[PDB]
Amino acid sequence: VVNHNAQALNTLVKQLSSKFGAISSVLNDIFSRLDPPEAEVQIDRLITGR
Amino acid sequence: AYTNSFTRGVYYPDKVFRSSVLHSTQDLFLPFFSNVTWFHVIDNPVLPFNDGVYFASIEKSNIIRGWIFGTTLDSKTQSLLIVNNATNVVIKVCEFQFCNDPFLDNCTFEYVSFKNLREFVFKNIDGYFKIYSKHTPIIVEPERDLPQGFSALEPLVDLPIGINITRFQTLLALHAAYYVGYLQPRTFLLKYNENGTITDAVDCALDPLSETKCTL
Amino acid sequence: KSFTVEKGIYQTSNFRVQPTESIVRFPNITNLCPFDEVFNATRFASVYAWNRKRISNCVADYSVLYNLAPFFTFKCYGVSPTKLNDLCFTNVYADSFVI
Amino acid sequence: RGDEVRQIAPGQTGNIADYNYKLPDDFTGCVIAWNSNKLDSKVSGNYNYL
Amino acid sequence: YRLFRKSNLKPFERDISTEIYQAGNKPCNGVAGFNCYFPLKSYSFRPTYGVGHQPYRVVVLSFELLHAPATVCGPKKSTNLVKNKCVNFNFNGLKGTGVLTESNKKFLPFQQFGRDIADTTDAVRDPQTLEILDITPCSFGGVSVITPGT
Ligand SMILES: *[C@@H]1O[C@H](CO)[C@@H](O[C@@H]2O[C@H](CO)[C@@H](O)[C@H](O)[C@H]2NC(C)=O)[C@H](O)[C@H]1NC(C)=O
Numbered sequence A: 001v002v003n004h005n006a007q008a009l010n011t012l013v014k015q016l017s018s019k020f021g022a023i024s025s026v027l028n029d030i031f032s033r034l035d036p037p038e039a040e041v042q043i044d045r046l047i048t049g050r
Numbered sequence B: 001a002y003t004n005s006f007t008r009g010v011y012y013p014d015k016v017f018r019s020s021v022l023h024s025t026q027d028l029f030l031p032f033f034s035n036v037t038w039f040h041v042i043d044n045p046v047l048p049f050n051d052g053v054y055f056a057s058i059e060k061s062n063i064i065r066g067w068i069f070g071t072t073l074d075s076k077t078q079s080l081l082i083v084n085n086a087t088n089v090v091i092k093v094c095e096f097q098f099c100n101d102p103f104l105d106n107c108t109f110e111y112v113s114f115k116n117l118r119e120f121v122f123k124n125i126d127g128y129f130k131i132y133s134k135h136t137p138i139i140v141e142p143e144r145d146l147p148q149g150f151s152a153l154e155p156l157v158d159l160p161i162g163i164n165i166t167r168f169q170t171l172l173a174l175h176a177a178y179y180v181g182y183l184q185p186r187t188f189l190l191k192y193n194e195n196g197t198i199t200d201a202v203d204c205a206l207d208p209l210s211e212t213k214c215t216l
Numbered sequence C: 001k002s003f004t005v006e007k008g009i010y011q012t013s014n015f016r017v018q019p020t021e022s023i024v025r026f027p028n029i030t031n032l033c034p035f036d037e038v039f040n041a042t043r044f045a046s047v048y049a050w051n052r053k054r055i056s057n058c059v060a061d062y063s064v065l066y067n068l069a070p071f072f073t074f075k076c077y078g079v080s081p082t083k084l085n086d087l088c089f090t091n092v093y094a095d096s097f098v099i
Numbered sequence D: 001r002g003d004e005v006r007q008i009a010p011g012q013t014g015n016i017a018d019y020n021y022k023l024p025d026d027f028t029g030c031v032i033a034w035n036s037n038k039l040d041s042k043v044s045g046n047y048n049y050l
Numbered sequence E: 001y002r003l004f005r006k007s008n009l010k011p012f013e014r015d016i017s018t019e020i021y022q023a024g025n026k027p028c029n030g031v032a033g034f035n036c037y038f039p040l041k042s043y044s045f046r047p048t049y050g051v052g053h054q055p056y057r058v059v060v061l062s063f064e065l066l067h068a069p070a071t072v073c074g075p076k077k078s079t080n081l082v083k084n085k086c087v088n089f090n091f092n093g094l095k096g097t098g099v100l101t102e103s104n105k106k107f108l109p110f111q112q113f114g115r116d117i118a119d120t121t122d123a124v125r126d127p128q129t130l131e132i133l134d135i136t137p138c139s140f141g142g143v144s145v146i147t148p149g150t
């Protein structure tokens, strides 16, 4: 009872690293490199994946 | 000749910092428990350069002095020469060619600076000639096999040459021993300690037992 | 979503503290950057022996490129060309030829 | 200035888009243009616009 | 302009060899002739030709994207450094918000960044002066209300 839940809380952190097929995992790079007209094609994938 | 590798050849995957964690990655490494060619000094031929080379040397008077890389060797390829006692590396990268029996009695870069072990890894990727190096004294002295233990390597030099390479030869002095090992793509797991150094690595392509460790 | 609240406890939202200042930091290199030597040079090399140049340790300004005549092709892959002035780079390689 | 209609049109930021005439991203409308180089061209250039 | 060669090239490579292309079945043996063509040819350019054949000058750039100590970027000016307060910061194109304080982590001379489990940035090195800093998110929490009957 003390073990399983702890593990079920760790994995949720690790899923924050996957890229979900986007350009980069870090959320600031997309807005610091691309343009507003086209960043919406990318942000959607991350939002859905999380 | 032939001799056991005995768990050597691990280098940093990138220039980032971590601490107290387990990580997994894939790159061109040297598989554990791999037989390695052996030579003695007088027997100094040209050896293949398939996909990167692991080079290691035992000496104390620095007989080994340079390398030559090329395909046809008609005075139209790069070479590397050094003048170093123990810790003073001097590099010239011009295209001078010696005679057909080299020995010791664009130039995009230039630099001037028993109880020894030299280790190097040469890698070629996308027009880049990456060179990783490591120096370490050995308290083992002469025995039958290569020194035991574990360590890590560091990245040193990059060069944007961009030429197809197939064969290489070493440069010796005349008036010590060395080894050659081949690279291979593979996936490992590593442990980053508390103080920021690599202390243990695990394969998951060697034995049935290790696959469980890799997947767990 | 009502005009009446029963006795008890409730949880509404969260709170976060706000910043008060802005900080930027950059290296103090102040050498003019030699883009002149390649763009408006006299004679370019041949395709089969294409020429390349290395650029490092300089302060860039990508707006001056607009001083030229109406271009035929000016495109970029991976970076929007407008904000090029807001990113820092390690090494620059530039290739030139004529087609 | 011809293609500067793109600046008049919703999209990326620029001098004409922001400091001369702007249209929001959610704007509903149309932009039409006729090549006036056949007519507006004059001897030694035209300097009647700023 | 190159015309003939046995097979294509890997990206970022050059070849200026003068070997004769063995087009025919006979072995040329380094002798130019029929079915043994010279690898290179020449173009032509006249001022009265059409735009379809006029010469064009082409330049290609290439980038590296902050994977090492950076050396080239714009003329943005620096500022004095403040710590122990909740501040917005920008280090070499890496933007963030939080609190900066002195730390004691030891790095190898070539290192430049520090990460963690969530791949977020934790420790940076000031390019202006060689010393190490870390980042801590600013304080936040949840709120609740207790009330009797209205
Ligand atoms: C560098 O060039 C050599 C030849 O110039 C390539 O060698 C080829 O090797 C394969 C594998 O045995 C042969 O099937 C080919 O016939 C060889 N080429 C020729 C022209 O005979 C070598 O592959 C090149 N390097 C790389 C990385 O591709």
Ligand SMILES: *[C@@H]1O[C@H](CO)[C@@H](O[C@@H]2O[C@H](CO)[C@@H](O)[C@H](O)[C@H]2NC(C)=O)[C@H](O)[C@H]1NC(C)=O
Pocket (backbone or CB within 6 Å): B195
């Ligand atoms: C990692 O480095 C730390 C220092 O940053 C080492 O901890 C110190 O060890 C010395 C012994 O050589 C003690 O005298 C100090 O008191 C220790 N520091 C503290 C804060 O207690 C640590 O030993 C190193 N890691 C390993 C495995 O040796």
Ligand SMILES: *[C@@H]1O[C@H](CO)[C@@H](O)[C@H](O)[C@H]1NC(C)=O
Pocket (backbone or CB within 6 Å): B002, B033, B034, B035
């Ligand atoms: C390597 O070469 C030696 C030479 O005798 C041989 O005995 C061995 O089976 C080979 N393979 C491995 C994995 O050691």
Ligand SMILES: *[C@@H]1O[C@H](CO)[C@@H](O)[C@H](O)[C@H]1NC(C)=O
Pocket (backbone or CB within 6 Å): C028, E128
């Ligand atoms: C500029 O940067 C160098 C880089 O180390 C630093 O040593 C120096 O103190 C800085 N300031 C001046 C005025 O040179």
Ligand SMILES: *[C@@H]1O[C@H](CO)[C@@H](O)[C@H](O)[C@H]1NC(C)=O
Pocket (backbone or CB within 6 Å): C035, C036, C039, C040, C064, C067
């Ligand atoms: C190249 O020369 C032209 C000459 O008119 C000049 O306008 C242009 O700015 C120069 N290029 C650079 C990068 O300065």
